[PDB]
Structures are given as C-alpha cells and as structure tokens.
Amino acid sequence: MTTSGALFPSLVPGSRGASNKYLVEFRAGKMSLKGTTVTPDKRKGLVYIQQTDDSLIHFCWKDRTSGNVEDDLIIFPDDCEFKRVPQCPSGRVYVLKFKAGSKRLFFWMQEPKTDQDEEHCRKVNEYLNNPPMPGALGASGSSGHELSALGGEGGLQSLLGNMSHSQLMQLIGPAGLGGLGGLGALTGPGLASLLGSSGPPGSSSSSSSRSQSAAVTPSSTTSSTRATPAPSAPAAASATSPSPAPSSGNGASTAASPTQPIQLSDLQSILATMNVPAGPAGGQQVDLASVLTPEIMAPILANADVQERLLPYLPSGESLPQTADEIQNTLTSPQFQQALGMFSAALASGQLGPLMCQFGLPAEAVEAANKGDVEAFAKAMQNNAKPEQKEGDTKDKKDEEEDMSLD
C-alpha cells in the first residue's frame, strides 16, 4: 500500500479566466494568383494574430469551410504595414504590404458591419508597429558586421581597376553647378532659437539724412495733387482657400490625377522575374483582356498570321489556342492575357498593323494599329464596340422602290 483508492486529484484543471489565445482575430478572406490573373478565394476565412515564445508577432489566415490552417508567417517589428485599399468602392478590401521583399497580400473583410473597419485595422497595425515588449531584438554598440554576407557578385564598383591613360579631363556639361548644397547648415542658434529669424524695430534710427520718395518731376513743378490721398492697400492678390479646376497634366485628364508609383514599377518588375507569373515589360497586358474580350478576339487570334508573330515571342511555359471555337468557349484567363500581351507587343511595334486592315476592324483602330497606338486602338474598339448603330432600331429609312431606284 501507499495511499487510499478514493483518488480524485489526478484529473487536470482548465483555465478560461483571462487566458486568451490570440492578440487579434477577425473574419476576412484573401486574393491569390490563378496564373497571371489574380482572383478572390471566395471561402469563409479568419485572420488571427498571436505572439511567438521568442516574443515576435505570428500572423495567420485559416479556412472556415472545414476549419483548416492555410497560411502563417512570423513577422518582425515594423516589417509589415496593414492599410485599406482606396480603389475599393465599399472599403472592405485591405492590403498587408511587406516593406522588405515588396510582397503585398490583398485581404478582404468578411465582417458584416463596417463600423469595426478602422478598429480592426488599428489593432492589427499597432501590433506590427509595437511588439509586446521583446528582449530577442539583439544589441549593437561597437560591434555587428558581416565579413561577406554571402557571394554571387556585388555592384559597389563597375570595375576594380579601369584601364585609361587619358583620365585627367573632367566631363563637360551645358551649364554646370555651384555651391548649392554646401550652405553650411544650422550650427545651433541661441540668439534666435525658434524666433523665426526676425530683427529689431527700424523706428529707433531717425537720422533724417535723406527723404527721397519721388523723381517723376521732368518739368520740376508738377504738383497737380491738391488734397486726394491714395493708400494703395492691396499690394498683391491672395486667397485663404484656393481650389484649382482647369488641372491638366499635358491634356485635361491625361496625368491630371496622381499616377506616380512609390518605386512600384521597379518592384513589380523584379517580382515578375523572381516568382509572379507576369511579364516585367508588361502590366497593360493583363488589363486589356477586360477591354478586348474573347468574343471579338476569337477570329483574330485563330488566324495563322497573328499566331506566327505570337509563337516566336513566347518566353516558354505557355501554349495559346489555335481556333476561334476554343477561344470563344474554352478558356480560364491567364492564357488569353498572354495572347493579348504578345499581340500588344507586335501591335505597338507597328508590324501587326496590315492584318487589322485585312480583318475589317474600325478605320480609327486600323489607323492606330499601323502607327502602334495601342491606347487609341483599345479606345476605338471600346467606343465602336457596336455594329452599324444599336442606339435605336429607327435607322431603316426606306421610302419605296420603283426598279429604276439604284441610280
């Protein structure tokens, strides 16, 4: 014997008395590449945020169709930023941008009430900014250097030595530059620190040595002004709340809105070479497939003269359709965007031009196609997407025939 047989304290207790599992949890889904085309993954999902035992932020997305974990990442302090997409009409689409790597995961909120929209964003982005007091960050005071940081070549120099005897002459320019940028900076003011750089009154100097205020006296006496002052109050025109409207960017719409990328043109180019199933010389290739849709492009891309310009410019890893009853009926999306993008490259060069004349496309598109104006070609085919009028059936103005009616 050792004890009794009336044992009870050998079944373990639980918790649920302020012992939370997660830092943040909310209903949201995401978008994914289905090839070159991005599509929403229209499952019910959950995003959640948790802390690691190393004291970093663990971010996770899970399914609610069966309940599976689908994606998870440990994120370092400041390494990501979560923001709402401004191009969204409702506001429910969001983006987690990774500042290292240039990766963007586009999310979409599946919470019904939009009253919590900014509240979830704030809670997420505060944990990405401020971690729950880690000690695993490291230290650097007078050490912390990598002696190579891997291999594969670096671009810190163009050549290690340049072979040039004639290297004494400087590059000649059309004007030059002076000392702008070497102004001296702030050294630490005391006499005007936060004052605004103003000086003392000018009423204290009253010597009266000169009193010149006019020289418009060629006849000497010209004192025709008897007793009529002119204060001259408005020295300049100004407004407290100006609001432009004529706003032009070289055209009254063309670049009048802000279209400048935040380095995104270079970042999307390297991503297209590294992992994204896109083209680095493209972007427009993916968009024009929504404008020049399969119904119009079916007999065009089914012609051999177009295929013989697409096929040799193909980068390998794709095989386009060859007949119109494939293109009009049997498609996904990426294959058509690849076809549209190789088409637009040959069109923009001008050499595809002659075929548009042979197919029988609109005269404004046929003109644009032979120049290489893909923007005007797309606009012409979008505006003239109709037959010989469709905005009323009353274009049938027959007024009888008497046989002798053909001349």
Side-chain angles (χ1 to χ4, degrees):
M1 282 178 73
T2 54
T3 185
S4 189
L7 304 182
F8 295 99
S10 190
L11 284 78
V12 290
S15 195
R16 306 188 295 168
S19 54
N20 59 295
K21 294 185 180 182
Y22 307 135
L23 299 175
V24 195
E25 128 280 332
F26 66 100
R27 298 180 185 244
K30 56 81 176 178
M31 300 182 185
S32 188
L33 288 152
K34 200 170 180 179
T36 308
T37 311
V38 182
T39 306
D41 284 316
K42 293 173 71 178
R43 293 189 175 269
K44 291 186 291 291
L46 194 92
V47 174
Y48 74 94
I49 307 184
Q50 184 171 62
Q51 192 207 290
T52 70
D53 62 309
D54 203 45
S55 302
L56 303 176
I57 305 302
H58 194 178
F59 194 98
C60 188
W61 186 73
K62 65 169 283 179
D63 156 68
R64 301 182 69 148
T65 322
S66 291
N68 293 295
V69 54
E70 285 292 330
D71 183 51
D72 85 279
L73 289 168
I74 297 168
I75 310 300
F76 291 101
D78 298 299
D79 192 44
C80 292
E81 167 173 5
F82 188 66
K83 197 173 183 178
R84 184 157 63 201
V85 172
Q87 295 288 170
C88 189
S90 60
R92 297 194 201 247
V93 181
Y94 269 78
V95 57
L96 185 70
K97 184 182 287 183
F98 291 66
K99 294 191 185 289
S102 75
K103 185 183 179 74
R104 293 175 292 155
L105 289 174
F106 283 83
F107 286 97
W108 54 278
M109 290 283 183
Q110 294 180 343
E111 297 296 349
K113 296 183 187 291
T114 53
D115 181 65
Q116 301 187 338
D117 194 86
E118 296 80 10
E119 174 64 30
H120 287 304
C121 180
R122 183 67 181 224
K123 273 173 163 59
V124 169
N125 203 65
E126 276 182 7
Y127 275 117
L128 299 175
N129 186 277
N130 187 59
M133 203 177 183
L137 301 174
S140 180
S142 189
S143 60
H145 178 233
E146 294 193 79
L147 302 174
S148 279
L150 306 175
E153 149 277 292
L156 188 63
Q157 45 67 35
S158 294
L159 292 171
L160 287 80
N162 199 75
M163 194 177 182
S164 51
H165 178 262
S166 52
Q167 192 60 254
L168 301 173
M169 186 60 185
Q170 294 182 34
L171 184 136
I172 302 169
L177 187 61
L180 301 171
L183 305 175
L186 294 170
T187 53
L191 295 307
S193 191
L194 288 75
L195 186 65
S197 81
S198 59
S203 49
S204 305
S205 46
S206 63
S207 187
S208 202
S209 188
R210 299 182 87 156
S211 283
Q212 297 179 186
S213 281
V216 287
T217 54
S219 294
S220 192
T221 304
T222 184
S223 53
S224 300
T225 50
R226 180 68 174 199
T228 51
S232 304
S238 186
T240 50
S241 297
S243 186
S247 307
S248 296
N250 293 70
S253 282
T254 311
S257 52
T259 58
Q260 295 287 168
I262 311 95
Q263 302 182 323
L264 297 167
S265 187
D266 180 63
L267 300 172
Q268 288 175 22
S269 181
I270 187 163
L271 283 168
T273 307
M274 285 292 102
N275 62 78
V276 177
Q284 176 173 306
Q285 303 187 318
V286 189
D287 184 56
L288 283 176
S290 192
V291 183
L292 290 83
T293 54
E295 299 290 350
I296 306 97
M297 291 292 100
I300 309 297
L301 291 168
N303 189 55
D305 307 287
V306 177
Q307 291 168 18
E308 287 289 333
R309 299 289 180 83
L310 264 56
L311 291 162
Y313 288 3
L314 203 159
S316 199
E318 155 66 343
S319 59
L320 50 129
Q322 63 181 326
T323 54
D325 58 297
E326 295 171 292
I327 303 153
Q328 190 163 30
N329 292 83
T330 302
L331 39 55
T332 298
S333 176
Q335 76 303 322
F336 188 67
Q337 293 179 323
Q338 284 284 173
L340 228 302
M342 286 185 287
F343 181 93
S344 287
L347 188 69
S349 296
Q351 59 179 26
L352 203 70
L355 303 180
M356 285 69 255
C357 319
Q358 197 71 187
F359 287 126
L361 291 169
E364 303 298 322
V366 171
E367 177 66 15
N370 278 278
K371 288 177 76 209
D373 292 328
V374 183
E375 173 68 18
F377 183 79
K379 274 295 298 177
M381 201 179 291
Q382 180 176 179
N383 275 63
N384 206 101
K386 293 80 156 175
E388 304 88 338
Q389 280 79 67
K390 188 173 182 289
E391 49 272 77
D393 297 283
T394 50
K395 189 197 170 83
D396 194 41
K397 297 300 199 301
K398 302 172 301 208
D399 189 39
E400 197 158 35
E401 163 176 291
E402 303 192 77
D403 176 74
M404 196 182 289
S405 304
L406 302 173
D407 80 280

